[PDB]
Amino acid sequence: MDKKYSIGLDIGTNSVGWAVITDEYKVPSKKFKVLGNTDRHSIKKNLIGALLFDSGETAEATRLKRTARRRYTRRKNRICYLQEIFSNEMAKVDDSFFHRLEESFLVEEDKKHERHPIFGNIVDEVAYHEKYPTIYHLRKKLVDSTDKADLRLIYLALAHMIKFRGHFLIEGDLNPDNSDVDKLFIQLVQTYNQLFEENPINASGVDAKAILSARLSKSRRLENLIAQLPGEKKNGLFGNLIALSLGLTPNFKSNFDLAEDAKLQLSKDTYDDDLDNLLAQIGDQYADLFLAAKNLSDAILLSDILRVNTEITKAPLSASMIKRYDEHHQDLTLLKALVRQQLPEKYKEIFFDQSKNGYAGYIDGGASQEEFYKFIKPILEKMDGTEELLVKLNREDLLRKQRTFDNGSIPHQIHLGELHAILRRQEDFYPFLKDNREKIEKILTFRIPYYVGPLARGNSRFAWMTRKSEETITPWNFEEVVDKGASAQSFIERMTNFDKNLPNEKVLPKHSLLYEYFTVYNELTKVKYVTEGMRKPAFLSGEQKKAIVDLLFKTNRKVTVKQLKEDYFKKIECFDSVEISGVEDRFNASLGTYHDLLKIIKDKDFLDNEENEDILEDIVLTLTLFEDREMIEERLKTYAHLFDDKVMKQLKRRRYTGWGRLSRKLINGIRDKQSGKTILDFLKSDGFANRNFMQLIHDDSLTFKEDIQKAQVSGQGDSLHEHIANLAGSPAIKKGILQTVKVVDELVKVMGRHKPENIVIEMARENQTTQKGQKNSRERMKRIEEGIKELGSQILKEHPVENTQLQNEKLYLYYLQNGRDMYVDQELDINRLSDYDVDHIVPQSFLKDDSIDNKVLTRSDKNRGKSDNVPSEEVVKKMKNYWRQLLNAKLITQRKFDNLTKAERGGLSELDKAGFIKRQLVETRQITKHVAQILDSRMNTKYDENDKLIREVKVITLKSKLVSDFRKDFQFYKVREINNYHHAHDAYLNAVVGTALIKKYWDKGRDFATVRKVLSMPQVNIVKKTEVQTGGFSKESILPKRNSDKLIARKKDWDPKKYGGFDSPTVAYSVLVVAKVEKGKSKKLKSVKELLGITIMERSSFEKNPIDFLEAKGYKEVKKDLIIKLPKYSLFELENGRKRMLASAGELQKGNELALPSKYVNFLYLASHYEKLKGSPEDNEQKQLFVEQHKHYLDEIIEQISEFSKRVILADANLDKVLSAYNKHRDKPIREQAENIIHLFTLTNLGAPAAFKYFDTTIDRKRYTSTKEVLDATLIHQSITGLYETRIDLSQLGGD
DNA sequence: GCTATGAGTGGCCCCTGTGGAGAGAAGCC
DNA sequence: GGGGCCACTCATAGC
RNA sequence: GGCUUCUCUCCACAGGUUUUAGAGCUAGAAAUAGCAAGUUAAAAUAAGGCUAGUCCGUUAUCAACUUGAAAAAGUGGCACCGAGUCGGUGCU
Prior knowledge:
Cas9; DNA-binding; Nucleotidyltransferase, domain 5; seven-stranded mixed β-sheet; six-stranded mixed β-sheet; alpha+beta; RNA-binding; 56 helices; 47% helix; 9% strand; metal-binding; magnesium; Cas9_PI; 1296 residues; manganese
């Protein structure tokens, strides 16, 4: 009698609840064998439990570090290339120069050559450092001087330029000489006036320098400048020119009456060709206009970077840095003088103390610029004569370093120009420089284009480059070796999906011709027409379809029903009145690509000839795959013999995007065995059948369907669970799905292999991490600062906003609205905000949202003003302008503004009200379907004689709202902060409710009593999944030198005492080792038994040969058989049932779960929401009275917490602190008592101890920092469900 | 009487900022 | 959020 | 049909940190006191690995025992009456 049973499952991002129930909702208990060496051979357990595990991580950090590693290697290569070029000459002047550069990081003890790196003698070094204080001085000297300089300084200059070459965002050559904004603006205006003498622009008196160099958005600057020009418009020709100079993408369709879109952008690489196209349409007279526009753009960008450099030289960057240094020097002198003359006492503080934020800290210490300004600002204002200093302080220009974080804006072309200037000046003296000028310039300019990828020789899983010849790739010969076009093709292809019906075929591009034919014939396939005298609608014949397509689809971009009726039925077939069914006013499919190719090639027969189909498809695929025009030219050169040069150029300009769903082989590649026709052939002509694509692929009379189920191959690349890896979602849900599958398998194993009747699955809600949320909070902080600065509200500058005020939606939303209510606009003060209530934009009942964007601040009275309705429309209108102002401040999110516009439109109607309610209830529930499918596939594996899957097992999906309603109705409250039994209880309720509802489509006496018994069980299996830690070797910050053995070397020969290094390696896992250690100065052998930590860095070394690794650490006479591998969260048991989990080699976590009787849980839930009951007033009052009557349970709860703590926690001081705090607040209101008590369980929660707040008193965490006591505990190994246990007593191992 | 350790307790510490190019899947409309 | 490291203070076992 | 959000891959940039070099001077046995100076540079940026690449090294996977290089496979009785981390009784 296989006991019929059902299994419940609760899948979350961190836990998997599992429960086994019979038909009577009872949870059976069984007696289980226990292996090991203890006396406890049989333990009885309940069939319920929940599995806890660490959340998975995505791959983002790994990708970031991998890319960084590649950059570092390639930069080292560039330095190597320059040194390789210079080696032959540098050998004659100073042989050891490169050794000195290479070993400079070593101490004087370990250097092999003389200690000064550059010249190796002190006098030359001192003279050099006095003559050129910074490398930029050397750069300017070499640029301007015509004299022969020492080769070593040339190497220094070239190396500094190469190793910090700067960004590549701006493409194309740039002229540094264009640095006058006003001059070039005037020149552009004069050119416009000359070409438009009839419409001169009055730009006299306009300070374009201030407007264009203003630190605003590009569109705002465009509006600002045009507003100062009378009669000129934003979208006008001159407005478009100014937008171009600002770096935007103006449209010149309208200004020149053009047929097609005319967008030009200087930052685009194709500016030359597009500008040439525009000139070919409007005339070559306007070329000077756009050249002046380009000059203006260059001036704008350079003045924005370099802040108005004056003196004429080919090296503006070096001059700017030197000027900055000189101003720094002068201001330091002035500040010293003033401080010493007025405030002598603080001189030592500002100029000597490194730990502070003074100047000494700003230079020698770790202080950044912002901190130095913050510390120095108040002192300057208390002294006299600091006007210039304060002005420079507000401008971020006082005492500025040369190497600062603003340099990210420097285009590389500046460095390229300085390089070329140096080489040109010094080429006369050094002949070898002349021949290698192009090589040296290209080393700076070259980069690997993004579509090629790593240049790997097959041994890297990330690589896709196809190499022509097996030579080593160098920056000078990149073109000859790497096939760029095939590289790009592969780069696009490998990311694309595959056809579902033919998994081994690639999908065709969206604008492929055959796709358009397929869609047109598919739509026309089911079109029915009714003429006079017809009793029934008739399908269109193949001849009719051919005629209609040839007449309309090849002649018009879009064909409508009226067009068909007036063009084919009446003109060709002579039918006056015809009814068309199934077609909605137009056909979705259109031959847009065909019409475009007709416009380009201008040959109807070439397009209509089926022999050209392959050529056209390859051309379309070429247009889809490649986005750089040069490659397109390269591949189209194959068909250049079929098209003239202008046609060739036209094709290079068109672009298509998107990919379809069906492959070529599926539609026109496979042929029916009986007929020889493809799906396209049948759609063109199917006779009386007129079978569509769905019918053709599902018709049993054709070979297409049969070949389809032939192709369906249940392949599992690598392991089978790789199917799970292919699902849509974060790995956080995916790890849980895999655990759920294995748990189901083990439950089936335990029950006796008889299959479960039914399975209930349900999904919980995801929670983001605290640290990453904190970084989000910091970004939101800086955005708040930007917004408030645009507002000008001064309240924030007195007190900087705290991360909690961001996390607390109230203050953050206060800053979003600039202290103005969003329903109805009035000034609001934060003290009044404490009273005010926050409300969703959408009415609460209609739709609820967890996100902060929907939940917006409002004043309490207007919050009460409207309920279950959108805000009144007129006040939303008056708020809309202020909302636009906030959007310009970027304070309010765009989606929030969309919600506001939805509110003003009115949005929800009664049917749409029901839609929004059902829509808050509904979750995307798409991953859930895949989980259900996987479980169904694993369970139901038998096919009937008709090859139909026999469904013995029914997979069920429910929604959390039903279970929540069930809990609320019958007072099965749950509180998360108590313990981990909540997941198990949720799974149990899921199973019960699912089975009940399926049977209905229940004894209210017996069933509820059974359920209350089930929720009252103290024994629930909680297992923490053991995991071997992996990840970084240590913390990434390098710490200074100090006398300790706990530092880890950065390199093999870099002693930490002399060079410092990393700290705090993360222990992969600990091993129990019994051996002998020499202790004392006598080196006496002592038998010891201790835990040794294995670092992640050493893991391979330990696993390769444990004995040698243990020996090298100083242990002797290691017993190999006793090497027991103990991962993180390994479980130990001590006396009195006190349990611990091994956090690492030296710290432990609490290991026991508090079993709290259910009546206390109900009381706490009722007390916590005493003022937030959502129900009938009568039941609310009954609950309130029930809370009042059982007030004495509070002392009961304190008693149970105290007893549990004294039994398993051992936190004497913290427990005494808690007890002392409790008596102090014994007259507080009950609700506050409950909310504080809820926080109290954090002491007794499973896992790592954490601090908590109790009323006003804060309790620090108690940490178990000694692992001696578990060396004689009972080790427990738990199977993934915790049902099977093997107990090993370590006290009998390695006795003294 | 003098030496050395170890054990616990409290407190501080943790790499960050950006741009460009793409193939894919889902919120609200 | 949680493990690592350090200064200090007491204790402790041996000698 | 539109939008943004999220997963995954590549190419770049700007910093930060570490050590060393940039003659500290004067009085003073020293402690120390005064005075001057400070902005830059080289190298490393997970230990390293063999497949020697202008490549690879932080994702995912992991109770114990037996067989396996690994992937993987095999290994653990039932019923009833009770419940403070599960206990007792009968059958096998």
